[PDB]
Amino acid sequence: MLEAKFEEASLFKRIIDGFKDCVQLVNFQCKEDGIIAQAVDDSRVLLVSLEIGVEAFQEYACAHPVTLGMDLTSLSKILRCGNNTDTLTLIADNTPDSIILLFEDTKKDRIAEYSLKLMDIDADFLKIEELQYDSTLSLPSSEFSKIVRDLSQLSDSINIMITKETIKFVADGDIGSGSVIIKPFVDMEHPETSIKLEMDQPVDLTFGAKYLLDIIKGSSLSDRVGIRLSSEAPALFQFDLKSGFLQFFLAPKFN
Amino acid sequence: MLEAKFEEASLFKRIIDGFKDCVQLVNFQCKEDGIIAQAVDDSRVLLVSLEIGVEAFQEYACAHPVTLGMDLTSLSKILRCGNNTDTLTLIADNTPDSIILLFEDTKKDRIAEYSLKLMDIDADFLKIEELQYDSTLSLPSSEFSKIVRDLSQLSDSINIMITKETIKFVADGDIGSGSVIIKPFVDMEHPETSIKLEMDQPVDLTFGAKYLLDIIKGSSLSDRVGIRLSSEAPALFQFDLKSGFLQFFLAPKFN
Amino acid sequence: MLEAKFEEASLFKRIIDGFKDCVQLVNFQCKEDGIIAQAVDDSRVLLVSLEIGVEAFQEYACAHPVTLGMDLTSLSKILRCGNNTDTLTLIADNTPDSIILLFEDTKKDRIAEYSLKLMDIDADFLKIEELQYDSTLSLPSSEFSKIVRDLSQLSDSINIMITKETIKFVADGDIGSGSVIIKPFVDMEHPETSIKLEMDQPVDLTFGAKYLLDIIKGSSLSDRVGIRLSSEAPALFQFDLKSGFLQFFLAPKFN
C-alpha cells in the first residue's frame, strides 16, 4: 500500500508542469526510498527523468515497490483541482487498478478525493547518464530561460558553444542572427545569481529550440539550472529539488 | 515466496528457445512487477535481455525480490517435459536453494513436478540501450528470418545498409555475393506484413551471421521484429510479447 | 531491519581501505540479495563500484531495501576499532537515522558497539559499463601494483598500449622515461601468476597516475586484477571477491 503526503500540492503539480509541453505518458516507480519516473517523447530525442526523495514529502509510506502508469494530461486536469496549497496525498493498494489523489485544506470543510485510472506501460528504464561530460556549467534558471526564449525567436536551432571561460549561445535564422555571451564569476552580493563553468574540453553543440523551450519549463522548480555537455552523448540539463531532482537528457543535431 | 502461473508452458518454453543456440547460463530476477533476465555470451558480443510482465502470466505472486540462476540446457531438458499446453507454475521460497517447475493438465491425472538446482552467478546487469539510434525500422519476423537464412549461405558476415527509404542487406563471400533490398510501405490489406523505416542518419553496419542466426530464433514469439541501428553502439533487435519483450543487443564488426 | 554478519571484520575494513585515498562519501544500497555501493570523486573522472553478495557474509538478513549514506573517514575511524578478526555485524532498522556496527570476539569479554550517524545523499547510480571493450587482460595484482608504483615515479601520466600479444606500460616525464613490457602466457607451475590478454582491437590510452595509484589499492582483495580497455569509454579495473566484486571505472586523458 502506497501513501505519500505532499505538504503543498503546488510542488507535485508544478513538478508535472515541469514536463508538460510533455513527453506523453509516464511510469512512476514508487519504492521504500521514494519515487522515480522517466519518459521519452515520440521523436525519442528528449528523455525526462525525475527523482523525488522521502525528505521532499511531508510524509511517505510504501513498504512495497509499486509502478504507476498514467497520462499526464489527465493527471494535470486532476491536478488543476484545489486551493494549490492543500495537503495532497497519493494513495494506492498492493495491486493498484487505479490511484487515489486526496486534497485536504486548512480545516476539514472541503475534502476532495479523485481517482485516476492507471495504465500498463512497458518501459526499459534508460541509464544514459555518463561519468564525465566534456563541459559542466551552472547558472540562474531565469537567465537561461530568458536566453532560450530570446534566441528561439530567430531560429529553430540554438547553438551552444563553450570555450575557456566563455559560454556562447547563438541562433541563426532567416530574419537575422543573435548571440548571447556569458562569462563565469562569483557573485558575493548573493551567490544565487552566480555563473559557474568547468571545462575539460571545448564544445560546439546545436539543439532544437522546440525542446530547449520544454527544458526551461523546469525553471519554476529551482533557482539554478545545471548544464552538462559532451559530444559523445545527449546533453544533461538538471534542476535540483529539496531532496531529489528533475533532469532532461537532450540529443544534439548532427548536421 | 515465488509462485508464477503460465497459461501455456509453450510460452516460457519457446521463450527459452528464443535464446537457445544460447548465451549459456542466465540470472532470472523475479520481483513484484514481474520477471527480468539478461545474459552475455562467451565472446561478449551479444547480450540477450528479457522482460516478462505480470499480464503475460495467467497468475503471478512474488512479494519478495528473488534471483534465480540456472543453466539453460538443464532448464530446456526440464522444459521438454509435457503436453506443451499444460498450466505451468514456477515456485520458489524465500531463500531458494532450488526452483520448482509444476506442470498440470486439463484434468488432474498427470501431475508433473520437477526441481531444478539453482546456481550462484555474479552479474552486473548491463544498461547499454541508448536514447536515440541513427536508424529505426521494423518488419515481419519471417521475412527478416528468411533474409538472414538466405544470405548467411554465402558469407559469415552480413552487411546492413540503410539510406533514404532504402534497406539493403548484403552478403559477400567466396562462392559469390547476394543482396536483398526492401523498401518501406503501408500494407492496408493487412498491416502485419507492413515494412516501416525511420532514418535520422544513414548507416552502414556489418554483423556476424553466426549471431544473426541466433537473433532470428525469436521469430517464434512475435509477428514483427524491430531493429534499431547506430554506429556508436550495439544494434538492437526486439521481439515484443503480450506484456514484455525479448531483445538482443549485438555489436557490429570494426574491419 | 538490516542485520549483516561478517566473519572477519578485516574483509569489510580492507574493502573500505580498497577505496580510501577515497571518493569521499558513498551510498550503500542494501537489499535482499546483498549489498551494492558506488561513488564518484570530486573531479568525476573515477567511479568506484562495489557489489557484495550474500555468500560473502557469515550471515545476512534484510527483507527490506535500505540505503545507508556515510562518510568514509568516519567509518574508517570506526573500522580501526578491534582485533581485526572479530565477528562484525551491521545493524539497521526500518527507517535508519543511524547505523550500528557491532564487534564481538572469540569469547564474550570485549563487546564493542559503535553507532555511526547516517547522511542524506542524492545519487543517480551510474551504469557506464559496456558490453564489449576493445581489449581485455588480467594479471597478478602485485605485478600491476608494482608496475604502477614504479612508473608513477617518472611522470603524472601513464600510457597503456596494447597490441597483438603485447602489453606495454609507459611513463614519460622530466627526469626521464620508463617502460614495462609484459606478454601473455600460461603459468602451469601455478596459474595464479599467469598473464592473460584478449585483443579485438589495439589500444593506446593514457591515464593519470594519481588515480591508478588509488586503483591498485584494491590489490589487498584479490590475487588477480582484470583490466578492460576501450577508447569509447572509461577503462574498467576489476578485483573479484568470493561472492561479489570491487571495480573502478577510470576516464583516460584526451591530450
Numbering used by the authors:
A (entry chain A), B (entry chain A), C (entry chain A): 1 to 255
Quoted from the paper:
CAF-1 association with replicating DNA, and the targeting of newly synthesized histones to sites of DNA replication and repair requires its interaction with proliferating cell nuclear antigen (PCNA), the eukaryotic sliding clamp that acts as a processivity factor for polymerases during DNA synthesis. Recruitment of PCNA-interacting proteins to replication forks is generally mediated by a conserved sequence in these proteins called a PCNA-interacting protein (PIP) motif that interacts with PCNA in a region between the two domains on a single subunit near the IDCL.
The X-ray crystal structure of the R61A/D63A mutant protein was determined to a resolution of 3.3 Å. The R61A substitution is located in β strand E1 and the D63A substitution is located in loop F (residues 62–65) in domain 1 of PCNA. At the site of the substitutions, there are small backbone changes around residues 61 and 62. Although the precise reason for this induced, long-range structural change is unclear, it is likely mediated through β strand A1 (residues 2 to 6) and α helix A1 (residues 9 to 20).
